[PDB]
Structure 1
Amino acid sequence: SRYKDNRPLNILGIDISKMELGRYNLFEVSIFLQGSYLNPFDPQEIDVEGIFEDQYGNQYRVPGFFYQEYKRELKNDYEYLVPVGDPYFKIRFSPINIGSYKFFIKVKDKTGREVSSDKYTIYVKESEKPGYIRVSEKNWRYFKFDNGRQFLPIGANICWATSKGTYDYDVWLPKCAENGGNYFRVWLGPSWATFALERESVKEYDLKNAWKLDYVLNLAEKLNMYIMFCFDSYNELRYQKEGAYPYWEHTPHYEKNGGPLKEPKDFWTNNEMIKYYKNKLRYIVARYGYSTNVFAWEFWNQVDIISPTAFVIGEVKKWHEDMAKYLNSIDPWKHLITTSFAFSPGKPEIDSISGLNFVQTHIYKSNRYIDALLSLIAYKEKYRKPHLVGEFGLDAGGNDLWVDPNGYVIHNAIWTTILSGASGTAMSWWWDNHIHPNNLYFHYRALADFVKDINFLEEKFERLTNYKFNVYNREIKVIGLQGKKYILLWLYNAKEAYQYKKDIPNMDSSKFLGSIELLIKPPIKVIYYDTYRGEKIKELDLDKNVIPIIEFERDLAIKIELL
């Protein structure tokens, strides 16, 4: 109990970040206090709350959180954080309406005594921010912002840094954002992760790693990027003898290391673990929930591959239902909630729970992965909620960077997924050893520039069907979407798309290859789009439903508009 206090409860100071701010922007209150509590991360010991009310009478109950300021530096090849001042408590709020808000601070400690502040008034003006990310009511395949504009996630996993810590995100994130990226995913466990909250304990959370997560979230805010926070990873509950980067023997949950659990199976039902997990969820909502740059709360990375001694489908299902309900109940902004599985088809008993707002796929497959992606996307339409291909790569023991230094595998997957009806791009692994050093960001820029000017929420897009190729020299295949105004096609050469040794196509391509007939009413306008340079190649007006295919090396995109 490093941070215990044993004084009579009193507020000693309140600092307010700003008295005027914009819609969806951060309003931060700092609270200095003394009190009686053993653990500032446990609301049964000390419960700080901010109670906000807009001019329409809507109320927001915002939990407060314990905070330590740090100043970062780089010591050669590792980040080092120097503490600045004593720790204290914070409230982080974000207004969804404009106008006036009234708020006050309340504190209760373990003695039952409660203290409170004076009522304060702040004023909120309109801003440019689009709001929080939600499921689209117009098309359940897709996400939207509160203002109604679509959110199509384009990006990659960026789940942890090297020892350089936040200094790596200073490099990766601007490159991603300047190349059309608006999405990444970070890990808050296991204990070795950059942002691990349960580093040494499951009862108290790591203030240094929480500060690093603040830093990265703030960088996302400046760059208009949106983050999935993955709370726990399967390694935590996987025994050494089971392989696959196991971590049970080292995890703070295990009794050997101070935690409540004798074996990982007990995670789902142990009363003490459940209590502390809810405290962690409260801490995460308190510290990060304000942010519209939090796209989603993800409970687990690949919960299906915890130890087989520990995976009890009915227990894991109930825990997800209960935790989703709890998290929603305490999150004033109701961020999206999800979970993930290593098994590519997922676990229907869990994926179908209403409390999980969207479903995911992880897939590492080397052969015919285009067809596998399409099949999984078609299959998961049964859930009638969005689908994110949250992890993707070859099944090559991590050798993607040697097999495919030009990123053709990523290229194929991002085009396939977007134009098959997934909510956004397939999300690559290997951000640090592949995407960045091989400078693969240009693939995302080309795709973003192709899709960004179409409102996917309103096109009534369906996976393409009723097509017929007429091509003699080659084997060309298509992944497509057909909507009420646009048809989007990705064509690929089946004999070239899965070979990765040749240099990036430098198109100079005038010849006719063949045609593809679609079930459309002319007249139409046809745009041919170079998927590597990210530019229009040619434009052609047509009076029939038969699209010439111009010459291309590997793959080519086509945008058709019903006129």
Structure 2
Amino acid sequence: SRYKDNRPLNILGIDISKMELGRYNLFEVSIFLQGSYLNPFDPQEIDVEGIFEDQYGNQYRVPGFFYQEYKRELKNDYEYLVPVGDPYFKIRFSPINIGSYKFFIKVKDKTGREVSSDKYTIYVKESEKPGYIRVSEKNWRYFKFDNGRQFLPIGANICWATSKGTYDYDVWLPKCAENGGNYFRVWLGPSWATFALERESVKEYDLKNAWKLDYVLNLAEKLNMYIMFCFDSYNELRYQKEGAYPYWEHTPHYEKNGGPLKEPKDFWTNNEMIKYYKNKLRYIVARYGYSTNVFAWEFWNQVDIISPTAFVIGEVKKWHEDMAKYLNSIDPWKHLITTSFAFSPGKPEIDSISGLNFVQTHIYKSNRYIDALLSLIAYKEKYRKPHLVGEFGLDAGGNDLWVDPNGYVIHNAIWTTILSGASGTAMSWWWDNHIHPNNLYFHYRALADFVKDINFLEEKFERLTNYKFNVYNREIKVIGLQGKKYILLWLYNAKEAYQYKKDIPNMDSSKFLGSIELLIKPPIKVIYYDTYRGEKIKELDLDKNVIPIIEFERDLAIKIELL
């Protein structure tokens, strides 16, 4: 209760960031008040809200949140945050419609007293922002922005920083963005994470870490990147004796550390814990929900490998149903909601919950992972909602770093997932010790430039099924999409795609290798695409359905336009 107050409830002053702003831009109200509360993070102690109304009858009820200003600096090798001023309350809003808005502030504290501001008027003009990310109504396999443009996530996990904190994201995000990346994922737990809200407590949230998440969200805004916020990770509910980076003994949920839980199993049903968790969701919506750069709320990293003493499928399912419904109801902008599992096939009892808007796969597999990805993507089409391969690698033990310095494993996965019908790229691990130091971003740039002008929302892509392969000197395989106007092929050498010792192909690719015959009607334009340099190798106009395959070392992309 470091932030208690026991004065009669009064608004003391408000600051408004701007009277005029663009569609989907941040409108921020700062509020100085006094009142009676033991915990500014608990709406039963103090409840700040902004009530906004556009000219079209839509009303938004935005919970407010407690805020401390900081000034960051880098002390040789660690970030250090210096508090500036007293903490206070904020409301963060983002307008969907343009035109005029009226809003007022309402506050209630534990005494039952209620105060409110007069109504203020703001004006919203048109802007360049595409809006929030939703499931496409045209093709449930894909995401869209509110303005109808596709959102095809290309990026990686970038879930926490080193001790340099936000200064690491100052380096990683611009590199990702300039190489076609528009997506990453961050962790808000366990308590050691860069953005951990529950750092010392499950009842009060860490204002420094929340400030760091502000900063990284703002950087994503400037770079047109979109973030999945992962609220909790399995480590929090896993006992030391169970291994796999366990954290229960250190987590603030545990009664030993001041929390309400005697054991991780009680997380799903303990009424005190459920109440604090809803307060946390309210804090997250209040502080970050305005942002169109929040791609999705993700409840859990790999909830299936919490302690087996704590996984009760019926209670975990009901908890996801109830929390998705609650989160949805208090989120004025209705961001996408998801959850994840370490078991690659997932848990159908939870994945089929309608409050979870898309499903995920995590897979770390060293052999024939191309076939595993294709198989999992075909399988999860049963849910009729988008599928994100949210984590991918060779080995949960990190073998990738030593055996694949050139990123061939990432390469194979991102081409396989895009051209098998997943909503976006497979999302690699190892951002800090693999992708960045080895400068593997060029793999994403080549993929992004290949799909850049393809509208997956209108192509009605189906997986390629009835081709004839005519290759003699090699075991070539193909993964393809067939659509209205395009056929997209990724061909790979089964003997070379899983060998990681050779240097990146520098292909002087003239010779004829073989052919693939497809059920299409000429004429067609065939584009051969170097997947490593990210450029057209050759372009060919054809009058027959026999498409030559030129020589390639490891793999080759082909884009075929139906004319």
User: Residues 93 and 3 from structure 1, CA distance in 2 versus in 1: closer, same or farther, beyond 3 angstroms?
Assistant: same
SS at match of 1:260: coil
**Counterpart Cα distance in 2 of 1:29 and 1:505:** 54
1:518 positional shift: 1.1
1:470-511 CA-to-partner distances (Å, cap 9, x unmatched) read: 000001000100001100000000000000000000010100
Q: CA deviation at 1:122?
A: 0.2
**Deviation at residue 154 of structure 1 after TM alignment:** 0.0
**How far did 1:17 drift?**
0.2
The 5 A counterparts of 1:298-337 are: 298-337=298-337
Decide which moves more: 225-234 or 517-526: 517-526
State the Cα deviation string for residues 14-55 of structure 1 (Å, max 9, x = none). Answer: 000000000000000000000000000000000000000000
**In the TM superposition, what is the alpha-carbon distance from 1:452 to its structure 2 partner?**
1.4
Q: State the SS of the aligned residue for 1:89.
A: strand
Matched-pair contact (CA < 8 Å) for 1:105–1:116: yes
Following superposition, the deviation at residue 75 of structure 1 comes to 1.1
- Checking the alignment, whether the CA contact within 8 Å between 1:46 and 1:110 is kept in structure 2 is yes
Q: 1:135, 1:144 within 8 Å by CA — same for their partners in 2? A: yes
* Change in CA separation of 1:396 and 1:279 when aligned onto 2, cut-off 3 Å: closer
Rounded Cα–Cα distance in structure 1 between residues aligned with 2:66 and 2:270:
26
* Contact 1:52–1:103 (8 Å) recurs in 2: yes
* Superposition deviation, residue 242 in structure 1: 0.0
Shift of 1:401: 1.2
Q: Deviations over 1:442-468 (max 9, x none)?
A: 000000000010110000001111011
Looking at structure 2, the residues matched to 520 and 310 of structure 1 have their Cα atoms a distance apart, in angstroms, of: 54
* In structure 1, C-alpha distance between the alignment counterparts of 2:290 and 2:344, rounded to whole Å: 32
Give the 3 Å change call, closer, same or farther, for CA 396–67 of structure 1 in structure 2.
Answer: closer
Whether contact under 8 Å (1:359, 1:388) holds in the other structure is yes
Equivalent position SS for 1:356:
coil
Which 4+ stretches in 1 moved above 2 angstroms? none
User: Are the structure 2 counterparts of residues 214 and 379 from structure 1 closer, same or farther at C-alpha, using a change threshold of 3 Å?
Assistant: same
Q: What's the CA shift for 1:280?
A: 0.1
Work out the CA distance in 2 between the residues paired with 1:116 and 1:395: 56
TM-superposed deviation, 1:522: 1.3
Counterpart for residue 80 of structure 1: 80
Q: 1:372-400 CA distances to partner (integer Å, 9 max, x unpaired)? A: 00000000000000000000000261121
Aligned-residue offset at 1:544: 1.1
Tell me what 1:277 maps to: 277
Secondary structure of the residue aligned to 1:343 is coil
- What SS does the corresponding residue of 1:457 show, helix, strand or coil? helix
The answer on whether the counterparts of 1:447 and 1:531 sit within 8 Å (CA) in structure 2 is yes
Native 8 Å contact 1:154 1:180 kept in 2 = yes
CA distance in 1 between partners of 2:420 and 2:399 (Å): 27
Distance 1:385 1:276 in 2: 30
- What's the CA shift string for 1:309-332, capped at 9, x where partnerless? 000000000000000000000000
Q: CA separation in 2, counterparts of 1:486 and 1:469?
A: 19
Classify the secondary structure of the residue corresponding to 2:457.
Answer: coil
Task: Compute the displacement of 1:76 (Å).
Answer: 1.3
- CA distance in structure 1 between the aligned counterparts of 2:66 and 2:246, rounded to whole angstroms: 31
Gaps of 5+ in 2: none
3-state SS of 1:409 partner: helix
| Pairs within 5 Å for 1:230-241 | 230-241=230-241
Contact 1:496–1:554 (CA under 8 A) maintained in structure 2: yes
Provide the C-alpha distance between the structure 2 equivalents of 1:38 and 1:395, rounded to a whole number of angstroms: 47
Structure 1 residues not aligned, in runs of 5+: none
Q: For the residues of structure 2 that align with 1:258 and 1:521, how far apart are their CA atoms?
A: 69
Report the alpha carbon displacement of residue 248 of structure 1 after superposing the two structures with TM: 0.2
Tell me the secondary structure at the aligned position of residue 556 of structure 2. strand
**Does the aligned pair in 2 maintain the 1:37–1:109 contact within 8 Å?**
yes
Q: What are the superposed Cα offsets for residues 408-428 of structure 1, whole Å, 9 maximum, x if unpaired?
A: 000000000000000000000
Q: Distance in 2 between matches of 1:237 and 1:273?
A: 13
Contact 1:230/1:299 (<8 A) preserved: yes
Q: Could you give the per-residue CA deviations for residues 333-363 of structure 1, whole angstroms, max 9, x where no partner exists?
A: 0000000000000000000000000000000
Deviations 1:267-326 (A, max 9, x none): 000000000000000000000000000000000000000000000000000000000000
SS in 1 for 2:553: coil
Other structure's SS at 1:79 match? strand
What are the equivalent positions in structure 2 for 1:161-176 lying under 5 Å apart? Answer: 161-176=161-176
Aligned 8 A contact 1:366 1:396 in 2: no
Does the 8 A contact of 1:394 with 1:409 survive in 2?
A: yes
SS at match of 1:3: coil
**Matched-pair contact (CA < 8 Å) for 1:488–1:560:** yes
**Cα distance, 1:118 vs structure 2:** 1.0
Aligned counterparts of 1:464 and 1:358: Cα–Cα separation in 2? 24
Q: CA deviation at 1:160?
A: 0.1
Q: Find the aligned partners of 2:13 and 2:400 in 1 and give their Cα distance.
A: 54
Q: Quote the Cα distance in structure 2 between the aligned partners of 1:267 and 1:46.
A: 25
* Superposed CA offset, 1:225-273 (max 9, x none): 0000000000000000000000000000000000000000000000000
Deviation of residue 521 (structure 1)?
Answer: 1.4
- Aligned partner of 1:458 in structure 2 is 458
- Identify the range of structure 1 (420-429 vs 74-83) with the bigger mean alpha-carbon deviation: 74-83
- The 8 Å contact of residues 517 and 547 in structure 1, kept in 2 or not, is answered as yes
Aligned length: 563
Q: Secondary structure at the match of 1:212?
A: helix
Task: Output the CA distance in 1 between the equivalents of 2:513 and 2:469.
Answer: 11
Cα distance between partner residues in 1 of 2:471 and 2:393: 30
Q: Which moved more, 1:363-372 or 1:391-400?
A: 391-400
Question: How many Å apart are 1:523 and its aligned residue?
Answer: 1.2
Q: Please give the TM-score of this superposition, normalised by the length of structure 1.
A: 1.00
Q: Distance in 2 between matches of 1:20 and 1:265?
A: 49
SS in 1 for 2:426: coil
